[PDB]
Scaffold this active site. Structure first.
Site, PDB file in Angstrom:
ATOM      1  CD  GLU A 257      -3.080  -0.532  -0.246  1.00 48.89           C
ATOM      2  OE1 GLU A 257      -2.977   0.267  -0.927  1.00 48.89           O
ATOM      3  OE2 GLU A 257      -3.910  -1.537   0.032  1.00 48.89           O
TER       4      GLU A 257
ATOM      5  CG  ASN B  50      -7.516   7.870  -5.573  1.00 44.83           C
ATOM      6  OD1 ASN B  50      -6.590   7.766  -5.648  1.00 44.83           O
ATOM      7  ND2 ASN B  50      -8.382   7.384  -4.465  1.00 44.83           N
TER       8      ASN B  50
ATOM      9  CG  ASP C  68     -12.443   9.286  -7.276  1.00 46.23           C
ATOM     10  OD1 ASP C  68     -11.368  10.034  -6.101  1.00 46.23           O
ATOM     11  OD2 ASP C  68     -12.391   7.245  -7.051  1.00 46.23           O
TER      12      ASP C  68
ATOM     13  CB  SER D 185     -11.792   9.594  -2.895  1.00 52.03           C
ATOM     14  OG  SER D 185     -10.285   9.042  -3.864  1.00 52.03           O
TER      15      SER D 185
ATOM     16  CG  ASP E 113      -6.375   5.766  -1.756  1.00 48.55           C
ATOM     17  OD1 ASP E 113      -7.400   5.921  -1.547  1.00 48.55           O
ATOM     18  OD2 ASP E 113      -5.923   5.291  -2.602  1.00 48.55           O
TER      19      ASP E 113
ATOM     20  CG  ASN F  86     -10.444   6.774  -0.377  1.00 48.24           C
ATOM     21  OD1 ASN F  86     -11.781   7.168  -0.770  1.00 48.24           O
ATOM     22  ND2 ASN F  86      -9.580   6.622  -2.041  1.00 48.24           N
TER      23      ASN F  86
END
Ligand code: NA
Length: 129
Positions: free
Chosen positions: A35, A46, A48, A50, A52, A59
């Site tokens: 990860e 990201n 969209d 969002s 992480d 997220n």
């Protein structure tokens, strides 16, 4: 902070993750490896909207609030910035909540793709735990 593999193994064990919900310690170390490469500052933004956050790339669509993700939930009830700490405590507590649902560690795609079904004990081998 960039943990050493064995250093992180010890810390996750001290935070009660060994066999948590049926997932042995090496699962958790493997998940962190793929990860974030053991980097507590890791971020992945990201398209969209969002993001992480942290060693387990948790997220902001579902789990933490960063105030920048529309239509989002904050199911771990934490600011995403708590996931960027050198202390892994907030990431671990959110991880325990995430893994206690129906999909388990399948919530981590990297774990699903690089760890699940493998001999994950190798990730804690030689660590003097
Ligand atoms: Na959120």
């Amino acid at each position: 902070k960039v943990f050493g593999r064995c250093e992180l193994a010890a810390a996750m064990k001290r935070h009660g993750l060994d066999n948590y919900r049926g997932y042995s310690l090496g699962n958790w170390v493997c998940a962190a490896k793929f990860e974030s490469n053991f980097n507590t500052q890791a971020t992945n933004r990201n398209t969209d909207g969002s993001t992480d956050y942290g060693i387990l790339q948790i997220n902001s669509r579902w789990w933490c609030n960063d105030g920048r993700t529309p239509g989002s939930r904050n199911l771990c009830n934490i600011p995403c910035s708590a996931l960027l700490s050198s202390d892994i405590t907030a990431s671990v507590n959110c991880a325990k909540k995430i893994v206690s649902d129906g999909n388990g560690m399948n919530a981590w795609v990297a774990w699903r793709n690089r760890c699940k079904g493998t001999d994950v004990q190798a990730w804690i081998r030689g660590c003097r735990l």
